[PDB]
Ligand SMILES: [Mg+2]
């Protein structure tokens with residue numbers, strides 16, 4: 664890896680991988696043997712075990728379930744639904760409703776799956792934590808509506824800045840990191856979560872994932888005529904070739920990873936600034952190592 668973040672994987676990964684189909688199957692999310700085979704080919708329990716190496720048993724299963732759900736949910740916007748913000752919001756409203764209370768049994772399977780994840784996610788977490796993580800979920804769903812609006816008007820982004828304002832929410836990294844707290848039964852001190860230093864660290868985590876994702880998905884997205892990929896956007900913004908745009912993105916990933924270390928080195932002083940007590944310093948260290956560092960490296964290793 665470009666910076667010395669250790670590669671990690673939950674020791675309980677084999678069982679979580681072997682049992683991963685039971686949950687989406689029970690919820691109606693995988694409707695056939697063919698769909699199950701397709702799901703296993705994604706390696707989503709493997710991904711979860713790298714984001715959540717500190718989790719085992721039911722806590723790791725929740726992480727596997729979140730990964731499974733992310734990809735099954737995203738599938739629902741592959742076709743015409745993703746081209747229309749009214750149709751996209753019709754679905755995302757039904758899913759996001761789970762944040763406000765129970766769902767009617769007529770709600771779509773993907774909404775019931777979300778509701779079950781969110782129910783488990785909130786267990787043992789402070790009300791203030793649940794409210795914040797719910798806000799992150801609503802940012803995510805609103806981002807899906809914004810993406811469908813762009814597709815509807817055939818209006819792809821013309822700058823990296825405009826693209827990032829949307830993709831930083833649809834990439835789903837912040838809810839992934841939120842789950843790492845729940846999966847580890849800890850909470851980073853809330854005033855430090857809000858800090859400028861931690862905000863920058865999290866933005867790096869989000870950005871590194873979305874940039875690597877756009878490189879990994881480039882050829883598939885080119886074949887579908889997708890225009891909201893950082894490579895295509897940089898070509899429009901700067902006149903660059905796609906080749907120079909990829910190289911720019913690679914340089915940006917490396918530079919941001921190096922900045923991540925710098926920001927990490929500020930955390931001792933940040934803890935002093937916010938007068939963290941002993942338990943709070945321990946919780947911040949769990950967040951740094953088990954939530955932020957893991958999400959930065961987990962997707963890289965998964966590919
Ligand atoms: Mg898909």
Ligand SMILES: [Mg+2]
Pocket residue numbers: 737740741745
């Ligand atoms: Mg899509």
